[PDB]
Design a protein around this ligand. Structure first.
Ligand SMILES: O=C(O)CNC(=O)C(=O)O
Ligand SMILES: [Mg+2]
Ligand code: NI
Ligand SMILES: [Zn+2]
Length: 331
């Protein structure tokens, strides 16, 4: 069995290997990359996402989200308070202000220590989940707006044509902005490109160990667990690496820098934080290997998770027994 320790693997495809996206995902899986839940892909040196980032300041962040924490430094939840709209140029100025800027630090490990010590005492503002793309239309390789759609994959594998669309999302971050422990909708893959700015630190649990994380989360967030049998779908809970290690949960960590892709694999729980002002683009995708994970994905039906239009068909076709309850939670 390849990669039996479930380490995060880093790949360096050549320009020739960068042509066929599906083929390269299958290659990484042949080497056991999915066992980690997360992989890094460094693009060939010849490649670029677009010519420059000099003209992005007028993008609008319609609903910036202030991420307010509750709990203790290593075990906390966050809620999102909506703020007034602002442009990317306004948000970048805010991120660089004395109130929000990255503190002085020695290295990524020092900054990580400072994040876990101090995150809860601040409320950073995240420009998340903005429909759009920063890839040039002329970029033919690993262009996250030009991927095969998940609806087309389901149709190819299973023979059933479904409604829905699959487009990318932009994320504008600042120091301490945080992504809570989660798997993707329907336990899909994700791909994330860090277009510019400061790094993103990731934590990940191997897919084969995801239920260990879920059992710890039920213990640590006992009211939330009574409220919902899949409350990690709410995307609000944080658990630090120190707490994971104290409780014997297998995990790994890695820092993504500008110009690098990350792929999350089906049922790979992940969480993390941004180092400073940055912009990322991410989208969900599927492969044949995903179908069995889609069929078994948990679902929130309490009303909290609320998701896109396109998830309806995935539930309806892959999980018909669950459909009626889940749809009630959507309405
Ligand atoms: O970058 C972020 O805030 C969150 N991204 C992801 O969870 C992802 O790409 O799957
Ligand atoms: Mg602009
Ligand atoms: Ni994700
Ligand atoms: Zn729920």
């Amino acid at each position: 069995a390849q990669n039996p320790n479930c380490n995060i693997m880093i790949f360096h495809p050549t320009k020739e290997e960068f042509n066929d996206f599906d083929k390269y995902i299958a290659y990484m899986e042949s080497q056991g990359a999915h066992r980690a839940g997360l992989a890094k892909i460094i693009p060939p040196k010849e490649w670029k996402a677009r010519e420059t980032y000099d003209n992005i300041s007028e993008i609008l962040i319609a609903t910036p989200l202030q991420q307010v924490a509750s709990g203790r430094a290593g075990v906390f939840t966050q809620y999102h308070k909506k703020k007034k709209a602002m442009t990317v140029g306004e948000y970048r100025h805010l991120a660089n202000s004395k109130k929000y800027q990255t503190p002085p630090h020695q290295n990524f490990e020092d900054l990580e220590r400072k994040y876990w010590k101090n995150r809860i005492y601040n409320s950073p503002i995240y420009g998340a989940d903005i429909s759009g793309s920063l890839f040039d239309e002329n970029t033919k390789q690993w262009n996250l707006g030009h991927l095969g759609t998940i609806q087309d994959l389901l149709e190819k594998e299973c023979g059933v044509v479904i409604e829905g669309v699959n487009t990318p999302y932009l994320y504008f971050g600042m120091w301490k902005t945080t992504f809570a422990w989660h798997t993707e909708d329907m336990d899909l893959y994700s791909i994330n490109y860090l277009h510019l700015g400061e790094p993103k630190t990731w934590y990940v649990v191997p897919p084969e160990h995801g239920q260990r994380l879920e059992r710890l989360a039920r213990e640590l967030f006992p009211g939330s667990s009574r409220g919902c049998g899949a409350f990690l779908r709410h995307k609000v809970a944080l658990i630090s690496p120190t707490v994971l290690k104290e409780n014997g949960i297998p995990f790994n960590r890695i820092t993504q820098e500008a110009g690098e892709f990350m792929v999350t694999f089906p049922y790979g729980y992940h969480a993390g934080f941004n180092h400073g002002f940055n912009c990322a683009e991410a989208i969900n995708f599927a492969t044949p290997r995903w179908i069995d994970y889609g069929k078994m994905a948990s679902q929130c039906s309490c009303g909290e998770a609320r998701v896109t239009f396109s998830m309806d068909a995935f539930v309806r076709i892959l999980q018909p027994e669950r459909y009626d309850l889940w749809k009630r939670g959507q309405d």
